[PDB]
């Protein structure tokens, strides 16, 4: 009494991973054209998203594609004769390098930071030093045209896929999300690189949202997504005079020649009241996950400068703040915050950022970078929009010690690509009907199976049918053609709603028509009839083969 | 277009016709897909009658 009817263009999707393409790389369109999916609830998992791995690869590839046509400082991996800067933090280094003409030499003097030098002999009169890691790999000088101001990147879908945003204002990142929306592109995501503190991010809509893969171990990074930003202003007060020498045929090396005025240390200012209010609210939100525990914030217990300090790019200069006056607090279950009196204060927390020039890029090891100096001084403002915390494991007397963390740059991108999931549309499906043979994309995803069988020409047209994109264009074409070939083999070519001669077997589903078309959505139906598609498809092609042979026999009768 | 059949098929080329009916293809294509959706639903209703 019920027969298999093949539908094409149903609002059904499966989880999948594709090579989404940036679009600052291709001009973006007026709006993302967001279609809110009513009555749709999807399972997100921020800690298993692929959009993060793709963004990581894109960033470690754009960065390494801007330093390729730039001067490599091979001629400067020479013995330096360095004295104290009394005309330590900085040294006045003299060296003999190679000049533009490949037969002469050149004597130069530059001021380098002590963190950029490694002694060749007992450190004290001049002492011998070389540039850090220059004898282990090549140091590439950044071209003056390299843009150190993060540019928002929009990730847009290839044909055949959709980005499912999550609009629950209090979502942490993992688990079921309702009020799911479909978008074509993401918002503008800045590739901001910062350790311990997330800078220039998006704020939480409602409150501080503690998120972690598992708040029970001491390995997973805890991301604190703030609702109100704390403003940080960082400066390098020294008035630097930049000099340059040529080290080859068109290869210009830039360095600090002298400093005008006195020598002052770089620093960052965070208002005490705003910081300690932020840490109070984060300590009360972390008390909701670790009940009856004492919550303490302390400085990092170890590691390299890139993770024990707050590392950030300020107008190209790479600062490294101590951040040990910030993370010094105790919050107990009684609700009193130990370092009190910081709610009526006018003080400032001065963090002594150090400056480094030979920056060990990412952790590639075999590739460093030289950040050229900028004449004059530098001041940068930024918004602190989140924290990266690591919890201390082991036995304890009911006290948690959340110490800053970072270094892994995926956890800096898992705090803006948290709401986005990539899915692949499955426009081809089957359902029982009484039929015998003889708006926007996914807009009806949450509608019943009888109201989504009218919006088929809208999810069908939006299938839109170097290497990273071209392979996904070819893949989308292959998937489209495989679906068309399936329809053709079944005798359904050229139709979106196709009635067949295959009877419905009650073992596939025993629901009545008023329990399917009127009460269920296409996603629930796909989740029901999924183990049986390898039987239905075979029956459909066998029935079409029988119909084709019967048709040629009838057409040869006369 | 208000031209008669003998003014279109017999007198005009396809380029002139494209230059004439070009602002209206976003209406004609929508009408064509709506008519096909109606025909497909009517066909499944006729094929379920019996």
């Amino acid at each position, epitope marked *: 009494n019920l027969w298999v009817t093949v539908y094409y263009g149903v609002p059904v999707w499966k989880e999948a991973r594709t090579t989404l393409f940036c679009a600052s790389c291709v001009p973006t369109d007026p709006n993302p054209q967001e279609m809110v999916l009513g009555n749709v609830t999807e399972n997100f998992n921020m800690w298993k998203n692929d959009m993060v791995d793709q963004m990581h690869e894109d960033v470690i590839s754009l960065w390494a594609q801007s330093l390729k046509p730039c001067v490599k400082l091979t001629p400067l991996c020479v013995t330096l004769e360095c004295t104290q800067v009394n005309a330590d933090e900085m040294k006045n280094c003299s060296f003999n390098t190679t000049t533009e003409i490949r037969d002469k030499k050149q004597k130069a003097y530059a001021l380098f930071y002590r963190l950029d030098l490694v002694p060749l002999e007992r450190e004290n009169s001049a002492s011998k030093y070389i540039l850090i890691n220059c004898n282990t790999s090549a140091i590439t000088q950044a071209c003056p045209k390299v843009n150190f101001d993060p540019i928002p990147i929009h990730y847009c879908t290839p044909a055949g896929y959709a980005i499912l945003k999550c609009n629950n204002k209090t979502f942490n990142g993992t688990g079921s999300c309702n009020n799911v929306s479909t978008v074509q592109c993401t918002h503008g995501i800045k590739p901001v690189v910062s350790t311990q503190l997330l800078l220039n991010g998006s704020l939480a809509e409602e409150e501080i949202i503690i998120r972690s893969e598992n708040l029970m171990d001491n390995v997973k990074t805890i991301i604190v997504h703030l609702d109100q930003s704390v403003e940080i202003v960082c400066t390098r007060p020294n008035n630097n005079t930049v000099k340059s020498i040529r080290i080859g045929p068109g290869q210009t090396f830039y360095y600090t020649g002298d400093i005008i005025g006195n020598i002052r240390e770089a620093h960052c200012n965070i208002s005490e009241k705003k910081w300690h209010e932020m840490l109070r609210r984060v300590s009360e939100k972390l008390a909701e996950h670790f009940p009856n525990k004492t919550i303490k914030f302390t400085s990092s217990s170890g590691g390299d400068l890139e993770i024990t300090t707050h590392s950030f790019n300020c107008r190209g200069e790479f600062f490294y703040c101590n951040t040990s006056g910030l993370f010094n607090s105790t919050y107990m279950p009684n609700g009193t915050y130990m370092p009190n009196g910081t709610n009526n204060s006018n003080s400032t927390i001065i963090l002594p950022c150090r400056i480094k020039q030979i920056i060990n890029m990412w952790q590639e090891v075999g590739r460093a970078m030289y950040a050229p100096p900028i004449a004059g001084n530098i001041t940068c403002n930024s918004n602190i929009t989140g924290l990266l915390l690591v919890r201390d494991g082991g036995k304890n007397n009911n006290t948690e010690i959340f110490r800053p963390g970072g270094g892994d740059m995926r956890d800096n991108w898992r705090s803006e690509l948290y709401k986005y999931k990539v899915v692949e549309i499955k426009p081809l499906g089957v359902a029982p009907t*009484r039929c015998k043979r003889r708006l926007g994309f996914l807009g009806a995803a949450g509608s019943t*199976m009888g109201a989504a069988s009218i919006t088929l020409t809208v999810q069908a047209r939006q299938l839109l049918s170097g290497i990273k994109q071209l392979q996904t264009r070819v893949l989308a074409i292959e998937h489209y053609l495989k679906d068309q070939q399936l329809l053709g083999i079944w005798g359904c070519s050229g139709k979106l709603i196709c009635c067949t001669a295959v009877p419905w077997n009650s073992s596939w589903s025993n629901k009545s028509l008023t329990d399917i078309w009127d009460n269920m959505t296409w996603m629930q139906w796909d989740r029901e009839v999924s183990n049986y598609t390898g039987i239905i498809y075979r029956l459909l092609e066998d029935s079409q083969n029988q119909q084709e042979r019967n048709e040629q026999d009838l057409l040869a009768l006369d | 277009s208000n031209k008669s059949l003998t003014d279109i098929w017999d007198n005009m080329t396809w380029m002139q016709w494209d230059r004439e009916v070009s602002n209206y293809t976003g209406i004609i294509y929508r009408l064509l897909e709506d008519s096909q959706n109606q025909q497909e*639903r*009517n066909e499944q*209703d006729l094929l*379920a*009658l019996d």
Partner: nanobody
Amino acid sequence: EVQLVETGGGLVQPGGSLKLSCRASGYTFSSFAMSWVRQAPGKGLEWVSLINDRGGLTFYVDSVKGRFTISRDNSKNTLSLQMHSLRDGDTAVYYCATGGMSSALQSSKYYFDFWGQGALVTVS
């Protein structure tokens, strides 16, 4: 309690035209395939025409093909039947009925579930 009220009918002379209309209330209108059924005085019931729930498909008894038009308006919750020529054999009470067909995504409704009170059509 659904209510089908047929507002129309009267007297015509052989060769004339007459329109009947039927208003529905108490249930979702655009989900039922409506029909018309004639009862001549002293005789039984005879089916005249059927229209689908969407209005796109119409079916008629052979004796009225080419003369009767059945139409429905799902925004006004009205059904109408417009008759031409009106022969003497068409004199009858015309009942508005709900049923006779389904949309292929619902169970078979090959029966006339809800009837109206009946319009009287006289040809003389």
